[PDB]
From a paper:
MDHAR reduces the monodehydroascorbate (MDHA) radical to AsA at the expense of an NAD(P)H molecule, with NADH being the preferred donor. We report, for the first time, the crystal structure of MDHAR of O. sativa L. japonica (OsMDHAR) to understand its detailed mechanism. Structural comparison of OsMDHAR to other proteins, using the DALI server, indicated that it has the same fold as that of putidaredoxin reductase (Pdr), biphenyl dioxygenase (BphA4)18 and rubredoxin reductase (RdxR). All these proteins consist of three domains: an NAD(P)-binding domain, an FAD-binding domain, and a C-terminal domain, as shown in Figs 1 and 2.
Except for the crystals of apo OsMDHAR and the OsMDHAR-NAD complex, which have one molecule in the asymmetric unit, there were two molecules in the asymmetric unit of the crystals. Lys53, salt-bridged with Glu178, participates in hydrogen bond formation with O4 of FAD, which is also hydrogen bonded with the carbonyl oxygen of Pro49. The conserved residue Asp298 forms a hydrogen bond with O3’ of the ribitol moiety and the phosphate group is stabilized by hydrogen-bond interactions with Arg48 and Arg147. The Glu41 and Glu148 residues are hydrogen bonded with the O3B and O2B atoms of the adenosine moiety of FAD, respectively. The superposed structures show that the unique long loop of 63–80 residues of OsMDHAR is adjacent to the iron cluster of Pdx, BphA3, and Rdx, and occupies a part of the partner proteins in the complexed structures. It is involved in the formation of a closed and narrow active site pocket with positively charged residues, which only accommodates small molecules such as MDHA.
Author numbering: 4 to 435
């Protein structure tokens, strides 16, 4: 049995950013442990569907450990040993008893704590969850952690020049479809929703991306689902059977159909809402001294005055920092202010890259040049409600442009003249 004053359960983005904040807050050797099922120290997970998959000059650990994806210092394994923060890796916790402050591993070792930060993130929804025949076939792959990324890069090499089907139409599907096309596969994306990234993109933003993708040669099948997967005599996938009747040949299937927060360990022990563990503005759960951060947390989003749960890397970083600040504040009796996050999401694929800030609520206007055949695409959109801007999206922005739309989203300026807005959208944002 090992005991630590502070235990972070999980070794992902929030964990890493929490450890950096504990360092900043003066954690001492022997106080903090991070327990992770992964075999490696915390890393910037968005690289797994971006540089990890590049056919040249690919991202590889230890390059993309935290905190370099935000421009911070890199926290190698030796950084945690130098600080006397114990990294307990390749350790899956399979039971948590909050009353006794005890975690148990799959092999039966126990760990106790005084303060617990739940930073377990999400697991992916699987094709078995849709009851799909043949979901269990080989070469049907998911992408959440670096072990998954290595299996994908190995299949890319094994099946080079083949056919790939990507199931899903959110931003993981978009990034995967683009990765496989860049790695020289024939690619088809399949999803039921009426356009890609339907929880964020408008039909007009989506039509840009869908057009750009088809111009790159990616096929897009919307309005259907897979109902089966054919497999050969080795159990390896060979074809995807769709509800619309089409049969797509496939050497590799890669799935991005969403995730689920990893809250099962705590079911019945903490209050839950919106698919997550409910927290206050300091990331403390219904059990004192147990906090929940990142993808699992359902928290008060101060600027919207509503409880929300978000799966954004920026929030994993910032909520981690907030929870450690709150922990340390309570020790010293020093106050900490309520978390005040501005939603920030981004994605990249091919040569494109977009950023979104604020809330996708209201009616939209598009600005700039949304011809997908442009040399250097650059266009955005505003979400307007009650005559003010609530959300902003930008593809192809400079740093100052991105900062300006972030300031629009944060400040919610009023719109006088829509035709001016639309004709000079970024100038609008720069004057704020
Ligand atoms: C492939 C990919 C690409 C992404 N791209 C972007 C992007 O471009 N932009 C963006 O804003 N966001 C993106 N995200 C989302 C972002 O990475 C997540 O929001 C962020 O990782 C959440 O951080 P977290 O610490 O809450 O969870 P995670 O980073 O998932 O960390 C959870 C950690 O806990 C471990 N763990 C879980 N259960 C246990 C257990 N019982 N025992 C031990 N350890 C356990 C996991 O193995 C993992 O180490 C992407 C995510 C993925 C998967």
């Amino acid at each position: 049995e090992k005991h630590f004053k502070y235990v972070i359960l999980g070794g992902g983005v929030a964990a890493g950013y929490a450890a950096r904040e504990f360092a900043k807050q003066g954690v001492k050797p022997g106080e903090l442990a991070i327990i992770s099922k992964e075999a490696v120290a915390p890393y910037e997970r968005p690289a797994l569907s971006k540089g990890y998959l590049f056919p040249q000059n690919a991202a590889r650990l230890p390059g993309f450990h935290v905190c370099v994806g935000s421009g911070g210092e890199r926290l190698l394994p030796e950084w945690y040993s130098e600080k006397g923060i114990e990294l307990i890796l390749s350790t899956e916790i399979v039971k948590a008893d909050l009353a006794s402050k005890t975690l148990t591993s799959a092999v039966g070792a126990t760990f106790t704590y005084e303060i617990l930060i739940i930073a377990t993130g999400s697991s992916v929804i699987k094709l078995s969850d849709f009851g799909t025949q043949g979901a269990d076939s080989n070469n049907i792959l998911y992408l959440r952690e670096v072990d998954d990324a290595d299996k994908l890069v190995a299949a890319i090499q094994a099946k080079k020049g083949g056919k790939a089907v990507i199931v899903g139409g959110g931003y993981i599907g978009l990034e995967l479809s683009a990765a496989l096309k860049i790695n020289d596969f024939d690619v088809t994306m399949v999803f039921p929703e009426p356009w890609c990234m339907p929880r964020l993109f408008t039909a007009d933003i989506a039509a840009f991306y869908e057009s750009y993708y088809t111009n790159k040669g990616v096929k897009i099948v919307k309005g259907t689902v897979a109902v089966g997967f054919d497999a050969d005599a080795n159990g390896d996938v060979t074809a995807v059977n769709l509800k619309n009747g089409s049969v797509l040949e496939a050497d590799i299937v890669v799935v991005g159909v969403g995730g689920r927060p990893l809250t099962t360990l705590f079911k019945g022990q903490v209050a839950e809402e919106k698919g997550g563990i409910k927290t206050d503005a300091f990331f403390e759960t219904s059990v004192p001294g147990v906090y929940a951060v990142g993808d699992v947390a359902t928290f008060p989003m101060k600027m919207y005055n509503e409880l929300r749960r978000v799966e954004h890397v920026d929030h994993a970083r910032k909520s981690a920092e907030q929870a450690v600040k709150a922990i340390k504040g309570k020790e010293s009796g020093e106050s900490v202010v309520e978390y005040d996050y501005l939603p920030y999401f981004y994605s990249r694929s091919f040569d494109l890259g977009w950023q979104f800030y604020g809330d996708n609520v209201g009616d939209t206007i598009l600005f700039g040049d949304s011809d997908p055949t442009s040399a250097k695409p650059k266009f955005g959109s505003y979400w307007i409600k009650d005559g003010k801007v609530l959300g902003a999206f930008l593809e192809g922005g400079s740093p100052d442009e991105n900062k300006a739309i972030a300031k629009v989203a944060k400040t919610q300026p009023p719109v006088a003249n829509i035709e001016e807005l639309k004709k000079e959208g970024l100038q609008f944002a720069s004057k704020i």
